[PDB]
Amino acid sequence: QMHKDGDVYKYFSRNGYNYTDQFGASPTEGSLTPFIHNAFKADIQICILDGEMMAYNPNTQTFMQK
DNA sequence: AAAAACTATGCATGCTCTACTGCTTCTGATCTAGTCGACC
């Protein structure tokens, strides 16, 4: 689950453990936020999303199971 | 002319540096096996 507050990101796992370090808290650092920041709209300052994280291989252009 | 005093020297001891070689032990780098956390 990802919480976006302006320029602040907070990633939490299924059990509530803080994963923001791995995925990043700000666009300047991380593995997902620096690249997915541009995908958000201008009129979205507060947002909460719940989803799944996978490993996308671009050579096959497909997701790889755990 | 004859006896005594001073100097040359020289060989041996112990110390000191200086190095060389061997053994013992401490430190560091690397490899392998086991363990913990998160998830599903």
Tab-separated table of all heavy atoms in Angstrom, chain A residues 11-59:
chain	number	residue	atom	x	y	z
A	11	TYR	N	5.494	3.644	1.780
A	11	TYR	CA	5.153	2.299	1.337
A	11	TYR	C	5.056	1.378	2.544
A	11	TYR	O	5.966	1.346	3.381
A	11	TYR	CB	6.194	1.768	0.348
A	11	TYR	CG	6.022	2.298	-1.056
A	11	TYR	CD1	6.334	3.615	-1.366
A	11	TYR	CD2	5.546	1.482	-2.073
A	11	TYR	CE1	6.178	4.103	-2.650
A	11	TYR	CE2	5.386	1.961	-3.358
A	11	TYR	CZ	5.704	3.272	-3.641
A	11	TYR	OH	5.544	3.751	-4.920
A	12	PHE	N	3.956	0.632	2.632
A	12	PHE	CA	3.723	-0.297	3.725
A	12	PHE	C	3.396	-1.672	3.161
A	12	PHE	O	2.763	-1.796	2.108
A	12	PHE	CB	2.583	0.183	4.635
A	12	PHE	CG	3.005	1.211	5.645
A	12	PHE	CD1	2.472	2.490	5.613
A	12	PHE	CD2	3.931	0.902	6.626
A	12	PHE	CE1	2.856	3.439	6.541
A	12	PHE	CE2	4.319	1.848	7.556
A	12	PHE	CZ	3.781	3.118	7.513
A	13	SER	N	3.837	-2.703	3.873
A	13	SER	CA	3.677	-4.078	3.430
A	13	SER	C	2.327	-4.624	3.895
A	13	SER	O	1.475	-3.894	4.410
A	13	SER	CB	4.836	-4.931	3.941
A	13	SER	OG	4.625	-6.302	3.654
A	14	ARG	N	2.063	-5.914	3.667
A	14	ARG	CA	0.813	-6.517	4.115
A	14	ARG	C	0.632	-6.468	5.637
A	14	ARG	O	-0.478	-6.245	6.120
A	14	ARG	CB	0.736	-7.968	3.635
A	14	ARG	CG	-0.311	-8.806	4.348
A	14	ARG	CD	-0.690	-10.028	3.526
A	14	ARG	NE	-1.600	-10.915	4.244
A	14	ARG	CZ	-2.085	-12.049	3.746
A	14	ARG	NH1	-1.748	-12.438	2.525
A	14	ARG	NH2	-2.907	-12.794	4.471
A	15	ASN	N	1.711	-6.674	6.390
A	15	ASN	CA	1.633	-6.664	7.845
A	15	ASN	C	1.880	-5.285	8.442
A	15	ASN	O	1.959	-5.160	9.669
A	15	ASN	CB	2.633	-7.666	8.430
A	15	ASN	CG	2.247	-9.105	8.150
A	15	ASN	OD1	1.066	-9.446	8.107
A	15	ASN	ND2	3.247	-9.958	7.960
A	16	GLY	N	2.004	-4.252	7.611
A	16	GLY	CA	2.250	-2.909	8.089
A	16	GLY	C	3.709	-2.525	8.203
A	16	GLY	O	4.002	-1.378	8.563
A	17	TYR	N	4.630	-3.441	7.917
A	17	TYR	CA	6.048	-3.110	7.971
A	17	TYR	C	6.375	-2.033	6.944
A	17	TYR	O	5.846	-2.031	5.829
A	17	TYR	CB	6.893	-4.359	7.715
A	17	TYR	CG	6.724	-5.450	8.752
A	17	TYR	CD1	6.981	-6.778	8.436
A	17	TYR	CD2	6.305	-5.157	10.045
A	17	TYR	CE1	6.829	-7.780	9.376
A	17	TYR	CE2	6.150	-6.152	10.990
A	17	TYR	CZ	6.413	-7.461	10.651
A	17	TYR	OH	6.260	-8.456	11.590
A	18	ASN	N	7.254	-1.112	7.328
A	18	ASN	CA	7.607	0.014	6.473
A	18	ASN	C	8.610	-0.434	5.416
A	18	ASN	O	9.733	-0.832	5.746
A	18	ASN	CB	8.180	1.155	7.311
A	18	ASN	CG	8.289	2.452	6.534
A	18	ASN	OD1	8.071	2.483	5.322
A	18	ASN	ND2	8.626	3.532	7.228
A	19	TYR	N	8.203	-0.370	4.149
A	19	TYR	CA	9.064	-0.704	3.021
A	19	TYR	C	9.517	0.528	2.249
A	19	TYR	O	10.068	0.392	1.151
A	19	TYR	CB	8.346	-1.668	2.075
A	19	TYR	CG	8.573	-3.127	2.390
A	19	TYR	CD1	8.459	-3.608	3.688
A	19	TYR	CD2	8.910	-4.025	1.387
A	19	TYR	CE1	8.668	-4.942	3.974
A	19	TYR	CE2	9.122	-5.358	1.664
A	19	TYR	CZ	8.999	-5.812	2.957
A	19	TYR	OH	9.211	-7.142	3.227
A	20	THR	N	9.301	1.728	2.793
A	20	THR	CA	9.629	2.941	2.051
A	20	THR	C	11.107	2.998	1.685
A	20	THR	O	11.471	3.615	0.678
A	20	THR	CB	9.240	4.176	2.864
A	20	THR	OG1	7.902	4.030	3.355
A	20	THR	CG2	9.322	5.427	2.004
A	21	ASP	N	11.970	2.366	2.483
A	21	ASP	CA	13.398	2.386	2.184
A	21	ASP	C	13.687	1.700	0.853
A	21	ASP	O	14.456	2.211	0.031
A	21	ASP	CB	14.177	1.716	3.316
A	21	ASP	CG	15.511	1.158	2.856
A	21	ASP	OD1	16.248	1.877	2.149
A	21	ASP	OD2	15.824	-0.001	3.203
A	22	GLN	N	13.077	0.535	0.624
A	22	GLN	CA	13.328	-0.196	-0.614
A	22	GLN	C	12.731	0.526	-1.817
A	22	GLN	O	13.363	0.603	-2.877
A	22	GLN	CB	12.766	-1.614	-0.507
A	22	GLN	CG	12.955	-2.450	-1.763
A	22	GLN	CD	12.686	-3.924	-1.529
A	22	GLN	OE1	12.797	-4.418	-0.407
A	22	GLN	NE2	12.330	-4.636	-2.593
A	23	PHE	N	11.518	1.060	-1.673
A	23	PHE	CA	10.839	1.723	-2.777
A	23	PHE	C	11.061	3.229	-2.799
A	23	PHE	O	10.769	3.868	-3.817
A	23	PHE	CB	9.335	1.432	-2.719
A	23	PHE	CG	9.002	-0.033	-2.759
A	23	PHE	CD1	8.713	-0.723	-1.594
A	23	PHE	CD2	8.978	-0.719	-3.961
A	23	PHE	CE1	8.407	-2.069	-1.627
A	23	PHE	CE2	8.672	-2.067	-4.001
A	23	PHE	CZ	8.386	-2.742	-2.832
A	24	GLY	N	11.562	3.808	-1.711
A	24	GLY	CA	11.868	5.226	-1.679
A	24	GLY	C	10.785	6.068	-1.039
A	24	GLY	O	9.595	5.765	-1.161
A	25	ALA	N	11.193	7.136	-0.353
A	25	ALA	CA	10.263	8.075	0.262
A	25	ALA	C	10.056	9.335	-0.562
A	25	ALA	O	9.000	9.965	-0.457
A	25	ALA	CB	10.757	8.472	1.658
A	26	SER	N	11.035	9.712	-1.371
A	26	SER	CA	10.994	10.899	-2.209
A	26	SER	C	11.481	10.537	-3.602
A	26	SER	O	12.193	9.541	-3.779
A	26	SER	CB	11.868	12.018	-1.623
A	26	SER	OG	13.175	11.550	-1.344
A	27	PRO	N	11.117	11.323	-4.617
A	27	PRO	CA	11.560	10.996	-5.982
A	27	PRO	C	13.069	10.996	-6.148
A	27	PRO	O	13.571	10.371	-7.089
A	27	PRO	CB	10.900	12.087	-6.840
A	27	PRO	CG	10.585	13.193	-5.887
A	27	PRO	CD	10.274	12.531	-4.586
A	28	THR	N	13.809	11.674	-5.271
A	28	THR	CA	15.261	11.710	-5.394
A	28	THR	C	15.905	10.359	-5.110
A	28	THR	O	17.047	10.134	-5.525
A	28	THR	CB	15.844	12.762	-4.448
A	28	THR	OG1	15.452	12.469	-3.101
A	28	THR	CG2	15.355	14.153	-4.826
A	29	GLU	N	15.207	9.458	-4.420
A	29	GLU	CA	15.755	8.156	-4.068
A	29	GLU	C	14.658	7.105	-4.157
A	29	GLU	O	13.466	7.410	-4.078
A	29	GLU	CB	16.363	8.159	-2.658
A	29	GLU	CG	17.098	9.441	-2.296
A	29	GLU	CD	17.732	9.379	-0.919
A	29	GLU	OE1	17.741	8.286	-0.316
A	29	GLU	OE2	18.220	10.425	-0.441
A	30	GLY	N	15.076	5.858	-4.323
A	30	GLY	CA	14.173	4.727	-4.374
A	30	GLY	C	14.327	3.937	-5.658
A	30	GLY	O	15.172	4.221	-6.506
A	31	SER	N	13.475	2.916	-5.783
A	31	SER	CA	13.469	2.045	-6.949
A	31	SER	C	12.213	2.168	-7.798
A	31	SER	O	12.240	1.766	-8.965
A	31	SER	CB	13.629	0.580	-6.518
A	31	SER	OG	14.828	0.391	-5.788
A	32	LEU	N	11.120	2.693	-7.247
A	32	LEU	CA	9.880	2.874	-7.992
A	32	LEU	C	9.437	4.327	-8.047
A	32	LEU	O	9.125	4.831	-9.133
A	32	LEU	CB	8.767	2.012	-7.374
A	32	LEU	CG	7.480	1.910	-8.195
A	32	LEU	CD1	7.714	1.112	-9.470
A	32	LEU	CD2	6.366	1.289	-7.371
A	33	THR	N	9.412	5.019	-6.908
A	33	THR	CA	8.893	6.384	-6.887
A	33	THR	C	9.602	7.309	-7.869
A	33	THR	O	8.906	8.075	-8.560
A	33	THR	CB	8.964	6.953	-5.462
A	33	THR	OG1	10.325	7.021	-5.023
A	33	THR	CG2	8.164	6.087	-4.496
A	34	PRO	N	10.932	7.290	-8.005
A	34	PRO	CA	11.576	8.238	-8.931
A	34	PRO	C	11.088	8.099	-10.358
A	34	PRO	O	11.173	9.066	-11.125
A	34	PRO	CB	13.069	7.893	-8.816
A	34	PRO	CG	13.195	7.079	-7.568
A	34	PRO	CD	11.909	6.336	-7.455
A	35	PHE	N	10.579	6.929	-10.736
A	35	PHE	CA	10.124	6.674	-12.095
A	35	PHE	C	8.612	6.737	-12.244
A	35	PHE	O	8.125	7.025	-13.341
A	35	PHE	CB	10.620	5.303	-12.575
A	35	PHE	CG	11.979	4.920	-12.045
A	35	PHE	CD1	12.136	4.453	-10.749
A	35	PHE	CD2	13.101	5.032	-12.849
A	35	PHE	CE1	13.385	4.106	-10.269
A	35	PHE	CE2	14.352	4.685	-12.372
A	35	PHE	CZ	14.492	4.221	-11.080
A	36	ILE	N	7.853	6.479	-11.174
A	36	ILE	CA	6.397	6.540	-11.241
A	36	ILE	C	5.845	7.886	-10.795
A	36	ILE	O	4.627	8.097	-10.864
A	36	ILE	CB	5.748	5.402	-10.421
A	36	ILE	CG1	5.986	5.587	-8.919
A	36	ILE	CG2	6.284	4.053	-10.874
A	36	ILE	CD1	5.062	4.756	-8.054
A	37	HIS	N	6.700	8.806	-10.337
A	37	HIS	CA	6.213	10.135	-9.982
A	37	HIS	C	5.610	10.842	-11.189
A	37	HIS	O	4.564	11.493	-11.079
A	37	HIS	CB	7.348	10.969	-9.388
A	37	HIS	CG	6.883	12.196	-8.666
A	37	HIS	ND1	5.599	12.686	-8.776
A	37	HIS	CD2	7.534	13.036	-7.826
A	37	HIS	CE1	5.480	13.772	-8.033
A	37	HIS	NE2	6.639	14.006	-7.446
A	38	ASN	N	6.256	10.727	-12.352
A	38	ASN	CA	5.780	11.427	-13.539
A	38	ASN	C	4.416	10.930	-14.000
A	38	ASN	O	3.732	11.638	-14.748
A	38	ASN	CB	6.795	11.276	-14.674
A	38	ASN	CG	7.948	12.255	-14.562
A	38	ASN	OD1	7.794	13.357	-14.037
A	38	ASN	ND2	9.114	11.854	-15.056
A	39	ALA	N	4.004	9.735	-13.577
A	39	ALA	CA	2.734	9.171	-14.013
A	39	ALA	C	1.533	9.767	-13.289
A	39	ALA	O	0.403	9.595	-13.759
A	39	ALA	CB	2.741	7.653	-13.817
A	40	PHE	N	1.742	10.458	-12.173
A	40	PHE	CA	0.634	11.019	-11.414
A	40	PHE	C	0.152	12.321	-12.043
A	40	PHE	O	0.915	13.051	-12.681
A	40	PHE	CB	1.048	11.264	-9.962
A	40	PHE	CG	0.564	10.207	-9.012
A	40	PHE	CD1	1.398	9.172	-8.623
A	40	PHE	CD2	-0.725	10.247	-8.509
A	40	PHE	CE1	0.955	8.198	-7.749
A	40	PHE	CE2	-1.174	9.276	-7.635
A	40	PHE	CZ	-0.333	8.250	-7.256
A	41	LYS	N	-1.135	12.604	-11.857
A	41	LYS	CA	-1.737	13.801	-12.418
A	41	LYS	C	-1.416	15.020	-11.557
A	41	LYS	O	-0.989	14.910	-10.404
A	41	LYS	CB	-3.252	13.636	-12.544
A	41	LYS	CG	-3.684	12.428	-13.361
A	41	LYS	CD	-4.267	12.839	-14.703
A	41	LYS	CE	-4.533	11.630	-15.585
A	41	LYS	NZ	-4.738	12.010	-17.010
A	42	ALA	N	-1.632	16.201	-12.141
A	42	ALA	CA	-1.344	17.443	-11.431
A	42	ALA	C	-2.317	17.678	-10.282
A	42	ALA	O	-1.936	18.261	-9.260
A	42	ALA	CB	-1.381	18.622	-12.401
A	43	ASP	N	-3.569	17.239	-10.426
A	43	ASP	CA	-4.607	17.479	-9.430
A	43	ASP	C	-4.720	16.348	-8.414
A	43	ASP	O	-5.807	16.119	-7.866
A	43	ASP	CB	-5.952	17.704	-10.123
A	43	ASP	CG	-6.943	18.447	-9.248
A	43	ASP	OD1	-6.649	18.648	-8.050
A	43	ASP	OD2	-8.017	18.829	-9.757
A	44	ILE	N	-3.628	15.634	-8.147
A	44	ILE	CA	-3.612	14.539	-7.177
A	44	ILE	C	-2.498	14.856	-6.184
A	44	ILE	O	-1.332	14.508	-6.398
A	44	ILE	CB	-3.397	13.170	-7.834
A	44	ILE	CG1	-4.500	12.886	-8.859
A	44	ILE	CG2	-3.349	12.075	-6.777
A	44	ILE	CD1	-5.884	12.718	-8.258
A	45	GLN	N	-2.852	15.520	-5.084
A	45	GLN	CA	-1.901	15.828	-4.023
A	45	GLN	C	-1.950	14.832	-2.875
A	45	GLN	O	-0.914	14.565	-2.257
A	45	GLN	CB	-2.153	17.239	-3.476
A	45	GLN	CG	-3.515	17.429	-2.824
A	45	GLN	CD	-3.668	18.796	-2.186
A	45	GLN	OE1	-4.120	19.746	-2.824
A	45	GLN	NE2	-3.289	18.901	-0.917
A	46	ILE	N	-3.123	14.279	-2.579
A	46	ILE	CA	-3.295	13.278	-1.534
A	46	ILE	C	-3.873	12.034	-2.190
A	46	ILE	O	-4.897	12.114	-2.879
A	46	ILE	CB	-4.227	13.780	-0.412
A	46	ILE	CG1	-3.483	14.690	0.574
A	46	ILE	CG2	-4.833	12.602	0.344
A	46	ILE	CD1	-2.183	14.139	1.097
A	47	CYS	N	-3.225	10.889	-1.982
A	47	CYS	CA	-3.701	9.660	-2.598
A	47	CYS	C	-3.246	8.455	-1.789
A	47	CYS	O	-2.196	8.481	-1.141
A	47	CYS	CB	-3.206	9.532	-4.042
A	47	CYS	SG	-3.110	7.830	-4.634
A	48	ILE	N	-4.054	7.398	-1.836
A	48	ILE	CA	-3.694	6.102	-1.270
A	48	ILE	C	-4.023	5.028	-2.296
A	48	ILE	O	-5.120	5.023	-2.867
A	48	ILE	CB	-4.420	5.833	0.064
A	48	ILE	CG1	-3.599	4.875	0.930
A	48	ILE	CG2	-5.806	5.263	-0.174
A	48	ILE	CD1	-4.201	4.623	2.296
A	49	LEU	N	-3.071	4.131	-2.540
A	49	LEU	CA	-3.241	3.034	-3.481
A	49	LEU	C	-2.897	1.724	-2.791
A	49	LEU	O	-2.060	1.682	-1.888
A	49	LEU	CB	-2.350	3.205	-4.721
A	49	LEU	CG	-2.520	4.484	-5.540
A	49	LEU	CD1	-1.659	4.434	-6.791
A	49	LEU	CD2	-3.977	4.702	-5.909
A	50	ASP	N	-3.557	0.652	-3.223
A	50	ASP	CA	-3.265	-0.695	-2.754
A	50	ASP	C	-3.070	-1.587	-3.968
A	50	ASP	O	-3.933	-1.627	-4.851
A	50	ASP	CB	-4.395	-1.231	-1.868
A	50	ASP	CG	-3.883	-1.933	-0.624
A	50	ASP	OD1	-2.681	-2.268	-0.570
A	50	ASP	OD2	-4.688	-2.154	0.305
A	51	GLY	N	-1.952	-2.294	-4.018
A	51	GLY	CA	-1.637	-3.074	-5.190
A	51	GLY	C	-0.621	-4.158	-4.930
A	51	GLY	O	-0.345	-4.521	-3.786
A	52	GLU	N	-0.071	-4.677	-6.023
A	52	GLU	CA	0.882	-5.776	-6.001
A	52	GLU	C	2.171	-5.357	-6.692
A	52	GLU	O	2.145	-4.663	-7.714
A	52	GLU	CB	0.301	-7.016	-6.689
A	52	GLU	CG	-0.457	-7.944	-5.754
A	52	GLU	CD	0.465	-8.840	-4.953
A	52	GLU	OE1	1.689	-8.792	-5.188
A	52	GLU	OE2	-0.033	-9.592	-4.090
A	53	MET	N	3.296	-5.787	-6.128
A	53	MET	CA	4.614	-5.530	-6.688
A	53	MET	C	5.140	-6.804	-7.336
A	53	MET	O	5.108	-7.878	-6.723
A	53	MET	CB	5.583	-5.050	-5.607
A	53	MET	CG	5.216	-3.706	-5.002
A	53	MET	SD	5.271	-2.354	-6.190
A	53	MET	CE	5.354	-0.947	-5.085
A	54	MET	N	5.615	-6.676	-8.572
A	54	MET	CA	6.123	-7.790	-9.357
A	54	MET	C	7.429	-7.379	-10.023
A	54	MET	O	7.830	-6.211	-9.994
A	54	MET	CB	5.116	-8.247	-10.429
A	54	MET	CG	3.636	-8.094	-10.062
A	54	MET	SD	2.877	-9.611	-9.444
A	54	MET	CE	3.162	-10.739	-10.808
A	55	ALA	N	8.094	-8.358	-10.633
A	55	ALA	CA	9.349	-8.147	-11.346
A	55	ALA	C	9.074	-8.235	-12.843
A	55	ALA	O	8.841	-9.326	-13.375
A	55	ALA	CB	10.398	-9.172	-10.920
A	56	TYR	N	9.104	-7.089	-13.518
A	56	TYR	CA	8.857	-7.016	-14.951
A	56	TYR	C	10.182	-7.131	-15.695
A	56	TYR	O	11.090	-6.316	-15.489
A	56	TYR	CB	8.152	-5.707	-15.301
A	56	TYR	CG	7.780	-5.569	-16.761
A	56	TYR	CD1	6.512	-5.911	-17.209
A	56	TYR	CD2	8.695	-5.090	-17.689
A	56	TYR	CE1	6.166	-5.784	-18.540
A	56	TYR	CE2	8.358	-4.960	-19.022
A	56	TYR	CZ	7.091	-5.308	-19.442
A	56	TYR	OH	6.752	-5.180	-20.769
A	57	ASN	N	10.294	-8.150	-16.545
A	57	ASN	CA	11.448	-8.310	-17.417
A	57	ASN	C	11.140	-7.670	-18.765
A	57	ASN	O	10.142	-8.046	-19.401
A	57	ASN	CB	11.780	-9.781	-17.600
A	57	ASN	CG	13.080	-10.000	-18.353
A	57	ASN	OD1	13.544	-9.128	-19.087
A	57	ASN	ND2	13.674	-11.174	-18.173
A	58	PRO	N	11.942	-6.704	-19.234
A	58	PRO	CA	11.664	-6.104	-20.547
A	58	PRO	C	12.169	-6.929	-21.717
A	58	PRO	O	11.688	-6.730	-22.840
A	58	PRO	CB	12.383	-4.747	-20.479
A	58	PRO	CG	13.371	-4.852	-19.348
A	58	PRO	CD	13.166	-6.154	-18.627
A	59	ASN	N	13.122	-7.839	-21.501
A	59	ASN	CA	13.550	-8.721	-22.581
A	59	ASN	C	12.388	-9.578	-23.064
A	59	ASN	O	12.169	-9.729	-24.272
A	59	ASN	CB	14.712	-9.599	-22.112
A	59	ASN	CG	15.983	-8.806	-21.879
A	59	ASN	OD1	15.972	-7.575	-21.892
A	59	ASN	ND2	17.088	-9.511	-21.663
